[PDB]
Symmetry: C3
Subunit: 383 residues, 3 copies
């Protein structure tokens, strides 16, 4: 639907994924943090190419499509919430219910036959771990848990994060994240030196192709992901060589991190432990449009008591956010951006030359092609 049929034919083994330029419909996605949206103060945003309005009403979140049924203007241009339960289009005063999208009133024509007989599209919203998730799909939504990595929703897991808009397609973000050899870019990181991480330059793989990854299609709440097991049989590269001469060494720190690395639909990486042995990193690459994503970073630490919680809050702000979420991950941002040109025309998917450590990436592409819950197209974006 999205990509020239010529290219799609050439990537048969994961063509649904190459097509999913705008992301995967019928999944939950994080778009902002709970505390960024107050009572009665609506926010606009674009998710999988659709402009959305989110409002907090009696503590509860609601999401309407930010496009009037009449002449297709964004309501956010001028928000007129004249009652608690409604929003009034600034243009001809079509008035919709936040709860169900129902065109309940037209102030400029009380007697109109459209009234009660049209519905602005709505999307479920759920708040969890101080994160706002929207189900960008059709019908009654599945549990949040299906579209979140293992442990994100654990009772004791405290979640702190950061969100920004990055100018690359979401998939370039995903693949960079789940790429075992890309850790080469992080070799001069501030986190690596100052927090004494053990970090190889990469891995010389071992075993058959089936031992590189473990596909998880078999989760009890219905998660779909791929674990990267290149470390299992692989030999870490700590002395990098050219013509058999050593020209670069990995970092020989004492702290062991990134034991498990996994990628889950709809596109969320989990690295454990990271950036410290007492934490995990959960990060989403959410489609905004074909060129843009929210980089939705979260750090998780199990906490029992408030003093634990408040201590973590403080470590997050003084160490982890600036030294890890920025320090470390800023290189991931540049790397994503640097792939834009080669994949901009959709030709990159066929002219790329992969090598052994990309097995993980390929397993993700296959996984994503088979278990996605729909492909967002221009038809979803338009009408």
């Amino acid at each position: 639907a999205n990509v020239d049929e010529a290219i799609l034919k050439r990537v048969k083994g994961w063509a649904p994924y190459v097509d999913a330029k705008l992301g995967f419909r019928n999944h939950w996605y994080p778009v902002m943090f709970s505390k960024e949206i107050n009572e009665g103060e609506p926010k606009t945003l674009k998710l999988l190419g659709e402009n959305l309005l989110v409002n907090r009403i009696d503590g509860k979140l609601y999401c309407l499509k930010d496009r009037c049924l009449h002449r297709g203007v964004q309501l956010s241009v001028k928000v007129e919430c004249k009652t608690k339960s409604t929003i009034t289009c600034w243009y001809h005063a079509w008035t919709y219910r936040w709860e169900d999208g129902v065109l309940c009133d037209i102030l400029t024509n009380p007697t109109s036959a459209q009234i009660g007989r049209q519905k602005l599209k709505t999307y479920p919203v759920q708040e969890a771990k101080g994160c706002v998730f929207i189900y960008l799909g059709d019908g009654d939504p599945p549990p949040l848990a299906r579209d979140t990595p293992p442990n994100f929703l654990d009772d004791d897991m405290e979640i702190l994060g950061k969100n920004q808009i990055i100018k690359s397609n979401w998939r370039l973000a995903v693949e960079n994240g789940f790429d075992p050899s890309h850790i080469y870019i992080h070799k001069d990181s501030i986190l690596v030196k100052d927090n004494d991480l053990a970090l190889p330059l990469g891995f010389a793989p071992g075993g058959d192709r089936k031992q590189q990854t473990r596909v998880v299609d078999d989760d009890v709440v219905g998660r779909k992901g791929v674990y990267d097991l290149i470390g299992e049989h692989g030999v870490p590269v700590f002395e990098g060589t050219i013509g058999g001469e050593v020209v670069r060494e990995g970092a020989y720190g004492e702290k062991i991190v990134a034991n498990d690395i996994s990628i889950w639909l709809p596109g969320v990486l989990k690295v454990n432990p990271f950036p410290n042995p007492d934490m995990m990193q959960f990060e989403w690459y959410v489609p905004i449009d074909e060129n843009t994503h929210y980089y939705f970073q979260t750090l998780g630490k199990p906490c029992a008591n408030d003093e634990e919680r408040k201590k973590y809050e403080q470590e997050f702000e003084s160490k982890w956010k600036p030294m890890a979420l920025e320090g470390f991950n800023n290189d991931d941002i540049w790397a994503r951006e640097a792939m834009v040109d080669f994949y901009a025309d959709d030709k990159g998917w066929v002219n790329e030359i992969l090598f052994e450590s990309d097995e993980a990436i390929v397993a993700w592409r296959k996984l994503a092609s088979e278990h996605n819950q729909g492909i967002q197209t221009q038809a979803h974006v338009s009408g």
Copy 2:
């Protein structure tokens, strides 16, 4: 010619109008005020996607296409008017007559076989009511009166206004203008308060459909337009309700305005009376390109003599311009801009959901579709 055939065959009610992205060829359009162009001071502008040069020579206006026949440069990059009767291309000095566009000389080669054997496109130009009209069309022009709203050319009707370039397709401007229910956007206008206007929110129509409008396809000078009769038999709305509760009230002033609204080919709106009961508004939405229009506003007031004309002028500069043409219509500007996205891919025309107040707009689309004097295409712009 301009819009995907797939889109056109799904707007069979008014397909030529949806195709008329660059506007309609073979009509007169206003592009500036007489006073804005002095003797021997050529001005460049773009009309229906064509770059034009206008000049005033011995008080009379002339118009040439601003594109040399030779290497297609705009003459206006460096205007060389070396005799009153001619313009000389800065590049290789092909020299053309203003009056007929004939290539009469070439300074770089006076023996060229091209001399007297080529002609640069000219367009008729005529001034009326201190407005400059160009006949962007072919062959002999009709009277100007055909393409102007009734009373605009009355001998006592004094015209003053303002012109600006607005980034929306000309049709978005037109429909907004002739939209009985968009009046809602003006409810907190300073004009409405300080000039004490009887402006409602909107209307509940009365009776037949054919009855909401009056099509004028039968005007003696060949005018073609639609009058809005929504509230000849239709009840106007002053108290806007949601779930029975009044949430908004219209305008409570003593002056009755906008008793007759009409839209005329090629795209000019008459609002009578407005913004005061002794005035009319005549405003054009002139296609510059696919994305842009001149918003050529005028106010007309009958004046007996130049004394009453001075008073009107004072009242215009001091009151009506800042309060009406800016204050009031500034809202019309950002409303047009708000429809751009939805209509940009030509998909807005199939995906819009209209209601009863838009009976007027649909009649216009059909009027325009039947009675236009031609569709401007890229073929006219280029070749």
Copy 3:
């Protein structure tokens, strides 16, 4: 390939030239000066649409395509030259030899089957007269002399130059350069006045179409060019008329310049003498992309010894660069830019109306169409 057949079929005689939007493959092009590329300090540039990296290693220049075979990033985003012989991609550390482009190492997996089995595209590079030439082509290069104008490579010819990026297609630049009537744009030039150059407004051509130019294909190094001979038997215009009336005069002067004007593949103009009787100007219009070129300007002066070289350089910096290469040729830059719109949709090639002195340009279009060594296409750029 690059241009629609609807157009190419209407320019028989020079359709390959019209197709050569990105320029001609399998020629040498100047891109920068020797002084600008230092030992161990690579630079990126785009030539014929392709991003390239140039390095100086043991004084010798090398050129690699600036696009990793792996995920198609530019290496130049973050240059890692870890030995004198190699460059290492910053992303996953694929390591390429400069000399032959072979993938000789990968620091992230030194056991990859990819090693020794892949080759990054290289191009030959060669320096002459302080200028850096890249052979943007396949296989083994011809001598550089084929792609330089005559006398440029002469033992005694001191070359001093200037280079900048200009926003027009390269062909618009060439055509303006070699256009015998374009001199009209130089009539108010400070160089013409202050150096008292004899400069007609143009030439009334002298007799036979077949003899306004001389094609050269027999040259000892296989150079391919056209000489403009309009001035051989042409009558100069010093008194330009409109309706018999003298409206502009040419520039009388002692100094006879530009009696020898030639254009050469791949796109280099020689004007001799210029801007003084004992100098000449060689200038290239080097395609960067469809919209953009390097305007690579040089002045040549036979210098017998160092006193001559040093006083030439004094003259260049104080006089010839600001008055000639900047003052005079600034008008050529605007002339090129003014033709962009007409040729941008490829329709200018069919809609242009030529006159007698354009014979020179047509001779060049046919020469170029006959003797170029390949058309650069999008598939050379991408894959």
